[PDB]
Amino acid sequence: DVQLVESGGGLVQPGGSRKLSCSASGFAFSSFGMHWVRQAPEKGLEWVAYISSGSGTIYYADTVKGRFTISRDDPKNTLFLQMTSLRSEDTAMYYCVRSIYYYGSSPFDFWGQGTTLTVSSSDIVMTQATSSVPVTPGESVSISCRSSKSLLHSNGNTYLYWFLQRPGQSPQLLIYRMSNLASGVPDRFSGSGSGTAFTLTISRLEAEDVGVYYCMQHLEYPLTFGAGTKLELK
Amino acid sequence: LPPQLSFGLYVAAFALGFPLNVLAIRGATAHARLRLTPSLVYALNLGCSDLLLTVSLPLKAVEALASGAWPLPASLCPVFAVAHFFPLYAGGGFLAALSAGRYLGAAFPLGYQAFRRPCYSWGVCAAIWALVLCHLGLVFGLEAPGTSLGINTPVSPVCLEAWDPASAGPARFSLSLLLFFLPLAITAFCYVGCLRALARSGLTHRRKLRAAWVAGGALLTLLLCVGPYNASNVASFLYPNLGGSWRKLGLITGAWSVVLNPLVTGYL
Amino acid sequence: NTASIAQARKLVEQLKMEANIDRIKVSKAAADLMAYCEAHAKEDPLLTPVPASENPFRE
Amino acid sequence: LSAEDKAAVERSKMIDRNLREDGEKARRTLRLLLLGADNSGKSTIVKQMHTSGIFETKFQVDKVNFHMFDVGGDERRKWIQCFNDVTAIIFVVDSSDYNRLQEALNDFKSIWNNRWLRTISVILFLNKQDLLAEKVLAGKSKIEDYFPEFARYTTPEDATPEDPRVTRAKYFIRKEFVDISTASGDGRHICYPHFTCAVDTENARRIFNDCKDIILQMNLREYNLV
């Protein structure tokens, strides 16, 4: 029912300009914060932009600050990203992320399909410490993640987000805290940890569990992803 | 007038008005705790301004015992003096605004009920505050563009009473015309309109007479106590020949405003 | 009428309920209520005030 | 202090803004509660016209919106508590029937002396005046059979009137309700009697004028004048 169809990618000469649009349907778009998240064709995810509901709060990544602009059109349910003076590192894959914020909300639940952009020629260190795990289906897999700063807050929340990206598919939200399982995720996924170290546990492995797992922090304004641990069948 | 009689009138007005003002402010706060209305805002502003003036009376009383002498040091002379002249041009103006509200409560009841906010009344009151401060500062800057400021010593320092009538005339006349006579006209027009609306929409003869008497306090104190002071200022501007006894009578009627404003048109 | 004899069965059922409750007296059930009241008294924060460490409604 | 807490605070602020806008929009309109026994033509008082539970009516007079609520379910003693803040109670009573006139007077007395309706004014509509005139000129039915004081009653000298018998019967019927309303209340709320035929079309103007008077009373009481 929830659809986020975004377009505007292609080949752009360096120093040029480009507009990326995203049309939303199947949900009350005006009541959601919306993110632009960029991943390199060989690296992992990297948060770029965020605009709150009602466009009262706008946050930019430091690498794209000044030359990138995010805007929202609520009558027609559309998000816009205007980018100017493109560098060589902006050739990437762009996802548009739906995210709401209240007491029991689960942010970053839905992700867009993405657009491909090609060009011619402090922050929490969110580490994984594991490039990949060779494993066979059936057993249980534990994936560790660490942060340069303690993610525990005085209100009791921890703000750790475990995401899964299937090969050729958009990332999906698995866990939105240490242990709060997301909607539609099987019970076989679980998570735990402490202020600095975190562990994601998968009890059983099927053919659809192959993919890259990311650990993300949501403690403060800059959002940093992990390096991504790849789980594949062998 | 002998200095002793003026001293006695001043101290009597202060001593009998201060409990009246604190009781009026207490009643206004008690009524405003339940809910906030523009009438309560106007009453609170009038009460606090008249309380400040009440605090202002006694040292001028003991100075008038000394027949124009100023035992207070000069540095405390101007910052105090404007305070004694602060509500005499402002508080009655608040009454005018209050009268306007009463007009809006009578001529257009549905529109006033559906389109009133206490924030509007607070902004209006702030407009009077800024207006009277701005014109008081502009007039007081003419005293010394830059002896002590606000004190002229005859050949015995004197606080704003030995000032040159040639410069005192136009300034006081402009202050009395702008800050009193226009609010007086607004109050009179609003009273006439409110009484006309009450007559056109009568409900009970006894209640109509009671409402007309209650609405009569603002005009009565505007042209009975503040009125003689501005009239004396106008007469001094037009005729600089007569003595300063009329100014003393104007200040005595200002003390009568001190004793009379908390008595009528207030949550006492 | 049918309604009157309907509440006749209704109050027959009420009599049966009072009869099987007649084994419990006022004193015994009052003692049970007393046991519950001074058995869970240390739990509720409404009786004994709780310090700021465990009170989430602090200013 | 966290980012999610700040975003939740922003969402709460947006909700507050929407609530304030809706509250002002609802504050613009005026609300009335319609009351009256059956066979009194209460539904056809206003020609201009949510039927679940309470029948709803909306009509505009001089760009002023009135929402009239008619509760279709006796047991009036309980749900009346919801209507202690309406602008007025439109009490419609049939004057053509003398058998149920005493019951209607008792109902009006119960509404007037209600604990939660201390400050709610009543606009009284003495409906079906033409049937009253036809019955009183028929001569078969007399007010003295039910109200003996009509035998000792005469029209006031300050009357502003049709047949004089019609006028005296109408003024007696009005004076009963006026005496009931003036026995209690003590000026907190008053009554506005009005005569009305079944084919009348100016009832909305009377309701608008009485509502304007009530709002004037509220404004005067707000400024501590009455």
Next chain:
Amino acid sequence: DQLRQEAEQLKNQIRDARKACADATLSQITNNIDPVGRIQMRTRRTLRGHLAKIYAMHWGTDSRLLVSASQDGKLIIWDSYTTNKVHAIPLRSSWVMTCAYAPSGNYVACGGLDNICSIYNLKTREGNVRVSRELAGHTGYLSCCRFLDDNQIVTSSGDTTCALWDIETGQQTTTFTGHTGDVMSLSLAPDTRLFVSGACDASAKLWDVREGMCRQTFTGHESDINAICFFPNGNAFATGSDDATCRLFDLRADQELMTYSHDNIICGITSVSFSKSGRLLLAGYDDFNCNVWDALKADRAGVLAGHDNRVSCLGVTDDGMAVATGSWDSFLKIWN
């Protein structure tokens, strides 16, 4: 006929059996306990979002996220820890008199003079609260509603009857039996097997949700019963009435146990609630504040004052950490 005579003598012998079961009073047994002392709770949170009279509230099972219903056609879900509004639900009918919050936290309910019980879903994929279901079988105004679970809800309405509804089918399962007056309040037992309901005929009734008819009847009031609440153990309940009095009845004795009243209060009682341990009884009155009685000693332990209008609703959270009340001055206040 003789049916009235046999019913009268049947009532008489039930009364004789109740008198025989009454060998002592609760006051005589409880006189040996020391008093709880003066209880003076403090107001910590004030919720100021509503613009009309608040008629009901209900705490969540997580001790936060309380739902409240007001006359401006608004349901508001509050995060009580931070005074943050989570959801604002507009209502089709502005005449709402009751609201319930599901124990699972996924649903809310509302109802009133429209004779409809509307259940709203809070956790949807669209991210907005939508009307999940409407129940339209009652012929009178809805007075109270309580969630048995996510699929069953028991409502009490102004048609002198109480009903049990299945959300999925949308049809009422058991219509129970009628009182002789308007049913004003309803309370659920902790084991969710029985429930008590008070009506306008000064009578309370204990019903079983399984067999579907009335098990017990309690009397003793002489005016409208407006509020009702079970004891924490489920073996007792308390009613408040327009007589300015509360009565604690006992289920296993079928006899009126304790009466709470004072000479200086004559106004009716709107909401009645118990503490977590059951030692304190909280009663909201029409004299603009709340009273804290001792459930055993039957004396005024404290007073919660600060509301500028009639106190309409009360509620104690599951862990007993705080109590939230709501009045007709568009205000909800939290005390501990």
